[PDB]
Amino acid sequence: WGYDLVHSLKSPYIDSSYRERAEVLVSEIKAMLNPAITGDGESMITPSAYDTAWVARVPAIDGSARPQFPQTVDWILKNQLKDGSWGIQSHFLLSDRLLATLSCVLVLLKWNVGDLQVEQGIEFIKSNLELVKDETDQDSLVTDFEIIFPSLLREAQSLRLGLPYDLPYIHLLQTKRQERLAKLSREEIYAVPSPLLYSLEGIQDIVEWERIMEVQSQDGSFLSSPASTACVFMHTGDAKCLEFLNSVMIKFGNFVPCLYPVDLLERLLIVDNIVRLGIYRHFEKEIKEALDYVYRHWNERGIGWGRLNPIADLETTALGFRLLRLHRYNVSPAIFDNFKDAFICSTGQFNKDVASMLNLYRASQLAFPGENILDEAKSFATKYLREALEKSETSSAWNNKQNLSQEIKYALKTSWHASVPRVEAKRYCQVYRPDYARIAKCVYKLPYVNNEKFLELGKLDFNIIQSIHQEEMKNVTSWFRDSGLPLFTFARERPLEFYFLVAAGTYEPQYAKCRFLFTKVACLQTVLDDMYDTYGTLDELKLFTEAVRRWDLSFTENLPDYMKLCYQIYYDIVHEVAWEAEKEQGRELVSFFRKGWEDYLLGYYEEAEWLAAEYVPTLDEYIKNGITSIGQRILLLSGVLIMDGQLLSQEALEKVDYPGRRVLTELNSLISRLADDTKTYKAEKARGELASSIECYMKDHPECTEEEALDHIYSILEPAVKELTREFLKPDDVPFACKKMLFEETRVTMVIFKDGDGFGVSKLEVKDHIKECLIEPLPL
Ligand SMILES: [Cl-]
Ligand SMILES: [Mg+2]
Ligand SMILES: [Mg+2]
Ligand SMILES: [Mg+2]
């Protein structure tokens, strides 16, 4: 550990060639995304054999005995898989292959072509249907499979195709179809747009086609589904339906996908993945263009995956809310009322429902003060997700191959606030799949979202940043060794821990100086802390505190030897920080820093007097002192004022730093003090340490229990965390990098104190985070 471990690191990723390579990847990615963000190549989605076969059914509008879109028939004839099914070869999903193959077989028969393909398709369907022994064999179901497949299979039955209609699994599916159809409000089909519009081709006996146009989308589609629209067209001759089908053929050539457009969901998925891979800083322009488009279509009624959907989609809407808010757009959690009653979202195909609830769960964590609906959403999504873990569908072959249960479990144990940013990006680089397949009417892929380039850049960029930090850690530990701080043997040496506290969140190459000075100050502070609350005597501390007031090196002749040294190092670090800040800021700051240091250490001295008198403060007193004395404020200031290119006027600084006000530095200090207390008060109580916030409350409330006391501390912490979030994301003219630096340091602090049982901080978990974040690179 420390000096020896760090100087043994020799990362190759430091060489300029790696960053130059990463820049080529950045340019390639910009070029790849351009059609989706700026051009007309939006909605890049794979073919749906199933939908293509429905479009192929449409007879020529000139009345001739041939398809209106003969290129789709040609496509189908040419794209059968080796096993006789139609679908995407990379991924096998039984329900997808069954539905698509039966769909294709039937249209080839309609046009009396493809005898061989039909023969091979029928064999696939028969042979695979006979492999199903029980329900656990069926695997994940494509959208509305239970409704559509029995309908499509009855069409085959009327043609007397050689299929096993009498299998128990087939009877079960009809049973499931009835179950679904029974909850249907049929009269309302025509008045209130619903998810079933996506699959009208499966409920043809139910729909009065003469009334269904009322819920048609503006582009002529039925909930963006080519199959569903083709069906309505063949029943009605509706011009707008035909226009939709034409527009999709024009866009894709000789096939159609199972959803179109997916303009909103695709843009959001692109941004989500770029952000989670930790590569967002390279694509500010593209993220802004993408989110601006989404925001244009954002409305009080929510959004669908496609901007023309006549009903909102929770998945897209929850994702949109989170990414928009995170990027400082103004959105209200009131949009979630669109998914309530008397919360529902228990209808639809399983993967979509789970995705919607994962997204709702993550969105709920971005709550601002007073947003009760998000607390409700959090509770609801949590319960949903825990139940989903117990459902057999979650353990289907399809879901297991994608590690769904692992993903759900990870989401539930992960608090957005209590996250290490660099670590989350590293971890996502290890989970992201370039060939990820999604499910709707058929299995599909979105290559703008899931591709090799994203991952290539993710892993490389992570490794480069890490190697840069490793060189910085050599500088840190080298400075530390010669700094004099190791001479204070009453204090633990933790230079890497403090470097991690800042570098795990504020990682960009240009902020080397910020990280360096922040680490120096934190190293000094741990000594000052041990000195005031443990090692020093009150009379010694009174002397040190007077020296603090005087700012005079000559005055230290009066101090004990160890304090003479401590004062010298303190004085040097304070003024090095101040010089750097004045350089970056172009205005005087020595006086402001000095006042900050005095208030902080006078805070320690007040606490030292309490300890000496065995005084237990009121909770109000303890928190007041703690906000000032815990040390986060002066430490944060020591970093935030020396960020390359980040100008903070007094006016701007006061927006994020203002003792006595609920601004970023104040909230961080409050949260740090109380989170620490919740994590540590029990070990400290046992050791006989001076009272914490818990103990102070109990003195204030003699009859209250320890349990009530701890609950009260959390009742202070939780509101404070929401305010922190709002202060961070709030639109203003404070350089965002500065606000982010403050917020991210708070987030890493919260990681250290997460899950406060009172026992103490896990020193081993800290080491593991440092190892993961700063020591071990990603294999390429
Ligand atoms: Cl996959
Ligand atoms: Mg202390
Ligand atoms: Mg201490
Ligand atoms: Mg503590």
From Swiss-Prot:
UniProt protein name: Alpha-bisabolene synthase
Main location: cytoplasm
InterPro entries membership: Isoprenoid_synthase_dom_sf, Terpene_cyclase_plant_C1, Terpene_synth_N, Terpene_synth_N_sf, Terpene_synthase-like, Terpene_synthase_metal-bd, Terpenoid_cyclase/PrenylTrfase
Required co-factors: Mg(2+); Mn(2+); K(+)
Purpose: Converts farnesyl diphosphate to alpha-bisabolene. Involved in defensive oleoresin formation in conifers in response to insect attack or other injury. Involved in sesquiterpene (C15) olefins biosynthesis.
Alphabetically ordered keywords of this record: Cytoplasm, Lyase, Magnesium, Manganese, Metal-binding
Recorded GO MF terms: alpha-bisabolene synthase activity; magnesium ion binding; terpene synthase activity
Binding site for Mg(2+) 1: 529, 533
